[PDB]
């Protein structure tokens, strides 16, 4: 129980010994603690007289310190400040320990009493630092630290301990005076006195640096320097700043370094994209993507370039692409593969960029130079269709199965962007038919994998026809096995009979003209009729002879020639075997073949030079064979091989078949849109015409995109089919 007058002189001497760093002994510290305890344990609570002296001493000491760091130079004071701050903090902590008792006996009592304006002793030292030394010197020290940060940004390294000390002091001076119990790092004064100034200085300095670099350096080096600046700024925040600056500084630097020049970025982008600098595009995307929703229009720019490049790609192919599908599909696939490689590495496989790639690929696949040359978009998938036929035709070269699977996968990838998928379906079905009925296919597992890929791409009903084509050819193979087993069991025939039974609905085929079956061929045809009557009487057959080959012996010549030809050619050869002089009208009345195909088969026979006209001096390759024109078999002709193939396509019938396929897919399109509008209009019953066609486009966009005259024609067809009624006056709305 000792009054403050006796205690205070010794206590002040000890506290001044603490603050002036001389490494005060432990005994003096415990003696000061004893002094404070014996004073406090002497009104109800007596700490105000002690607190006032501590408050006044700290005010007096800091004012005496402020004179030393009043107006020294900017680079000096900061160092000074840091040093003083460090010692002050340490001294205050030691001081706190003494008034640790004052932190429990009296300060807690005042906080419980509600009398504000009072603090714990360490917080008191911090607060009186915030009001006697930090406030007048704050502008000078923050200007100095901004100058030193500018110096470090310019290139000259400097001691980061000074900056870290200043920022740590700025963080620690933020105190919640009203609620000291509310813990956590309070950054009120750090944001109010440093963050604003630092952010403004960073804005100004990067504005100046970016403008100078654009005016004195190319764009790509500016991208390099800007990425370096952003990484260095993350380093600066990480090393000697606060954590909370990381988000705000990164946003501000992205807004001032990349955003405000973003327009000129586009000015480089396409030009950069003109040079195919994949790494530079990668850097470009990496920097641009830090701005939210800034890629968007830029993204679209990529799309446009790809489309342009695609058109130029077709311009590299020229007229040959209209008749050589391999180069056309290879060119389109090469452009798609190159841009997929560029978007999967430089652009990090962005979903928006992949969507732009797909949109551009569709835009130059469905309509490009060859489609303009053929004045129709339907040439775009058909050529692709022909391409896959070229990868399934059994040629002399034998492609490897693995690379065949890879390139069929690439073909499927190209086909994914086809709009007119039904045209490709019909053309592939026709080419698969032409391959299978002549058993001229490649490895069967490749065919099965291609069919499975088409199924996975477009559902079941897209290739259900092809799947039933395969099951039908398997059934036909088994039926041929049954026929040969039965004929080995029964009486033997005269020829090797290898019929391929075919389905009348799935396979796209047209029945040719009638035919005069040979008697020895009729003797086997009747046996086959008895065979199928025994096996299955519930089926009927048509027996078209347009696609039916076979080798026949050639006794009425030099030796045995086993050349094979078409059924019409075999009929003509047998008719000449009966009598070696026949007119065109005679062949017409004998074989019962209509004029056009008979003329075609006769002119390809004359092209094969197996037999000659009645006059040798007469034309062969440019003669129109009238019905009265006589032809005599040229017995003097010699064949270089025992087996000679004559079944080669004619260009006229090739074009006729192609336009027939176009007409067939046109009528299939009409039937499909008719059935689709019938199925749709029953659901709504009130929907108007433009909305109806929009809904049709949405539902069958996965199949094709019809032209609006076809839509109007289908609308008229369904109007005068009386399935649904139209509204008089208002022709848009319909009803059922």
């Amino acid at each position: 129980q000792i009054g403050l007058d006796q205690i205070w002189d010794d206590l002040r001497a000890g506290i001044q010994q603490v603050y002036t760093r001389q490494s005060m002994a432990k005994s003096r510290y415990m003696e000061l603690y004893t002094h404070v305890y014996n004073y406090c344990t002497s009104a109800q609570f007596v700490g105000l007289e002690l607190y006032k002296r501590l408050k006044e001493f700290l005010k007096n000491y800091l004012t005496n310190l402020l004179k030393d760091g009043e107006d020294l130079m900017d680079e000096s004071v900061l160092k000074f400040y840091t040093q003083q701050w460090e010692d002050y903090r340490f001294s205050s902590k030691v001081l706190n320990g003494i008034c640790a008792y004052l932190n429990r006996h009296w300060v807690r009592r005042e906080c419980d009493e509600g009398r504000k304006g009072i603090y714990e002793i360490y917080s008191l030292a911090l607060v009186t630092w915030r009001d006697c030394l930090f406030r007048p010197l704050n502008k000078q020290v923050t200007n100095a630290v901004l100058k030193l940060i500018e110096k470090e940004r310019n290139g000259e390294t400097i001691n980061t301990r000074l900056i870290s000390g200043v920022v740590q002091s700025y963080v620690e001076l933020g105190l919640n005076e009203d609620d000291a119990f509310a813990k956590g790092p309070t950054l009120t004064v750090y944001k109010e006195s440093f963050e604003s100034q630092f952010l403004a200085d960073t804005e100004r300095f990067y504005t100046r640096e970016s403008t100078e670099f654009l005016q004195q350096n190319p764009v790509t080096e500016y991208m390099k320097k800007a990425e370096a600046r952003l990484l260095e700024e993350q380093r600066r925040v990480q090393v000697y700043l606060h954590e909370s600056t990381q988000d705000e500084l990164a946003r501000k630097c992205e807004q001032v370094l990349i955003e405000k020049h973003l327009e000129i970025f586009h000015t480089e982008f396409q030009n950069l994209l003109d040079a195919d600098k994949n790494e530079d595009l990668g850097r470009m995307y990496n920097l641009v993507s830090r701005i939210q929703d800034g890629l968007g229009e830029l993204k679209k720019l990529l799309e446009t370039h790809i489309h342009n490049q695609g058109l130029a790609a077709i311009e590299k192919c020229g007229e040959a692409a209209l008749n050589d599908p391999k180069m056309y599909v290879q060119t389109v696939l090469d452009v798609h593969k190159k841009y997929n490689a560029l978007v999967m590495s430089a652009f990090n496989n962005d979903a928006g960029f992949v969507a732009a790639l797909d949109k551009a690929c569709g835009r130059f696949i469905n309509n490009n130079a060859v489609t303009k040359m053929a004045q129709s978009s339907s040439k775009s998938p058909e050529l692709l269709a022909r391409y896959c036929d070229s990868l399934l035709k059994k040629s002399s070269k034998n492609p490897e199965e693995a690379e065949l699977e890879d390139t069929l996968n690439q073909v499927m990838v190209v086909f994914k962007y086809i709009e007119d998928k039904d045209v490709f379906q019909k053309f592939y079905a026709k080419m698969l038919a032409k391959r299978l009925v002549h058993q001229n296919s490649a490895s069967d597992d490749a065919e099965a994998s291609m069919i499975s890929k088409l199924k996975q791409a477009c559902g079941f009903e897209y290739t259900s026809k092809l799947q039933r084509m395969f099951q039908d050819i398997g059934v036909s193979k088994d039926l041929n096995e049954q026929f040969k087993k039965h004929l080995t069991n029964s009486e033997p025939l005269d020829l090797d009979f290898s019929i391929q039974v075919l389905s009348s609905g799935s396979w796209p085929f047209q029945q040719s003209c009638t035919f005069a079956l040979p008697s020895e061929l009729e003797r086997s045809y009747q046996r086959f009729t008895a065979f199928y009557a025994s096996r299955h009487s519930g089926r009927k057959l048509t027996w078209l002879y347009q696609l039916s080959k076979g080798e026949l012996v050639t006794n009425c010549f030099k030796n045995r020639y086993t050349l094979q030809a078409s059924t019409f050619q075999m009929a003509i050869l047998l008719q000449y075997n009966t009598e070696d002089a026949y007119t065109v009208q005679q062949l017409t009345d004998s074989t019962q073949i209509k004029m056009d195909i008979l003329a075609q088969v006769l002119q390809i026979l004359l092209k094969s030079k197996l037999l000659v006209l009645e006059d040798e001096n007469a034309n062969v390759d440019e003669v129109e064979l009238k019905p009265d024109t006589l032809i005599k078999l040229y017995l003097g002709y010699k064949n270089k091989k025992l087996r000679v193939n004559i079944n080669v396509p004619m260009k006229t019938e090739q074009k006729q078949e192609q336009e027939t396929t176009h007409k067939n897919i046109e009528e299939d399109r009409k039937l499909l849109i008719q059935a689709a509008i019938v199925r749709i209009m029953k659901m709504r019953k009130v929907l108007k015409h433009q909305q109806l066609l929009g809904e049709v486009l949405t539902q069958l966009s996965s199949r094709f995109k019809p032209r609006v005259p076809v839509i109007k024609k289908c609308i008229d067809i369904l109007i005068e089919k009386e399935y649904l009624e139209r509204v008089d006056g208002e022709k848009d709305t319909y009803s059922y």
């Binding site: 009979f497 391929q500 039974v501 389905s503 080959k549 080798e551 009425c556």
Partner: peptide
């Protein structure tokens, strides 16, 4: 004379 030894054909199965 002409003799037949091999001739493949295609027939269209149609459900009635």
């Amino acid at each position: 004379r002409f003799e037949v030894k091999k001739w493949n054909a295609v027939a269209l199965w149609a459900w009635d």
